[PDB]
């Protein structure tokens, strides 16, 4: 009947509970059968049956409000979400997606498709500010959980909601993609701090696809071309290799077929 569901709450959130969540998500996003340079590859979009296409991440807070997010298992990205009797979807880029998302939350009373997409550029201009000016951590997650919930009742406005998306995507999608960003959130969560992300986190987000390509295109682990990146102090450094990334990126989109038996 329903796609797989992962449960998480911000109530009593520890570093432990957060990490065992993000791990459980990763468990559902990939089998782990496709692993290249030690890194799990996301299932290939082409030929993928609609019934394996999405996963469900349910989020609740101390107020006991809950929302369920839909993640595409091919890009590990949020395509929409449900709160109570209403379901909301980001504007599809093509016919094929538009079809796919009709297999989600089919029992919901009301179904809305946004006139806008869920890409960062779009969300930033709606919420009124950049990812860098938007804070993260257990507290900003609790508020976003609520704002998404009360949107269906008219309680939430657009910029506030947009910002709420930016937060959850990063804390969940981005967190699942990168063990590094998972660590950045662990930090925040552990001490109950809240802070906007640094240039390193942001650039990693912008670079996910390209890294995925280079890695699967690599020659015995060596890139054909480097990818620019920033550390926390916003200074650039170039990545010519794989072994650097293994501690960083947890999942990869599917660029091409796996490698030969050798390595």
């Amino acid at each position: 009947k329903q796609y797989p569901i992962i449960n998480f709450t911000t109530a009593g959130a520890t570093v432990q509970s957060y990490t065992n969540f993000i791990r459980a998500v990763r468990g559902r996003l990939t089998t782990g059968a496709d692993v290249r340079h030690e890194i799990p590859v996301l299932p290939n979009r082409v030929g993928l049956p609609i019934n394996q296409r999405f996963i469900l991440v349910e989020l609740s807070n101390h107020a006991e409000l809950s929302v369920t997010l839909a993640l595409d298992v091919t890009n590990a990205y949020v395509v929409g979400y449900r709160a109570g009797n209403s379901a909301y979807f980001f504007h599809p880029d093509n016919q094929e997606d538009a079809e796919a998302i009709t297999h989600l939350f089919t029992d919901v009373q009301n179904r809305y498709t946004f006139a806008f997409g869920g890409n960062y550029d779009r969300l930033e201009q709606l919420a009124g500010n950049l990812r860098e000016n938007i804070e993260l951590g257990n507290g900003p997650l609790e508020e976003a959980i609520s704002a998404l919930y009360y949107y269906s009742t008219g309680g939430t406005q657009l910029p506030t909601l947009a910002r709420s998306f930016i937060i959850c995507i990063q804390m969940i999608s981005e967190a699942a993609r990168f063990q590094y960003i998972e660590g950045e959130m662990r930090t925040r969560i552990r001490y109950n701090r809240r802070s906007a992300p640094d240039p390193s986190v942001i650039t990693l987000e912008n670079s996910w696809g390209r890294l995925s390509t280079a890695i699967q295109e690599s020659n015995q682990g060596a890139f054909a071309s480097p990818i620019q990146l920033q550390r926390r102090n916003g200074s650039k450094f170039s990545v010519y290799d794989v072994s650097i990334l293994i501690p960083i990126i947890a999942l990869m989109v599917y660029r091409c077929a796996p490698p030969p038996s050798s390595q």
Partner: nanobody, 129 residues
């Protein structure tokens, strides 16, 4: 600034035909969900037809089902309502309504006047005999 203007209204006889047009401007039309409603005096405002942002998914009030056809030209920034076998019941002021927030609205919400932020001035449809 978003604009909604309906034309094509008038008077016809039971069985007669009409072609309705809404001229929309401003905003991004090609990404906006759209519908037609109607209201007769003394009567509550009733849903008529809805159409998503792409060419096709569409819903009708069953009284009008098969008699009426809603369409849109996203290049022309235009919405259309075709009314063919016309009845005295169909007499009412017809309004076009836009949602700039939503590309598509289905399920219960699709019939609710509340879910659409922009409305047109309206055009009168009277049917005789």
């Amino acid at each position: 600034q978003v604009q909604l203007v309906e034309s094509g209204g008038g008077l016809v006889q039971a069985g007669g035909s009409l072609s309705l047009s809404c001229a929309a401007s401003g905003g991004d039309f090609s990404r906006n969900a759209m519908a037609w409603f109607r209201q007769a005096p003394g009567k509550e405002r009733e849903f008529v037809a809805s159409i998503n942002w792409t060419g096709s998914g569409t819903y009708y009030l069953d009284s009008v089902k098969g008699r009426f056809t809603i369409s849109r030209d996203n290049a022309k920034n235009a919405l259309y309502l075709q009314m063919n076998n016309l009845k005295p019941e169909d007499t009412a002021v017809y309004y076009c309504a836009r949602s700039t927030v939503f590309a598509e609205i289905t399920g219960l919400a699709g019939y609710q006047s509340g879910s659409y932020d922009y409305w047109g001035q309206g055009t009168q449809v009277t049917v005789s005999s």
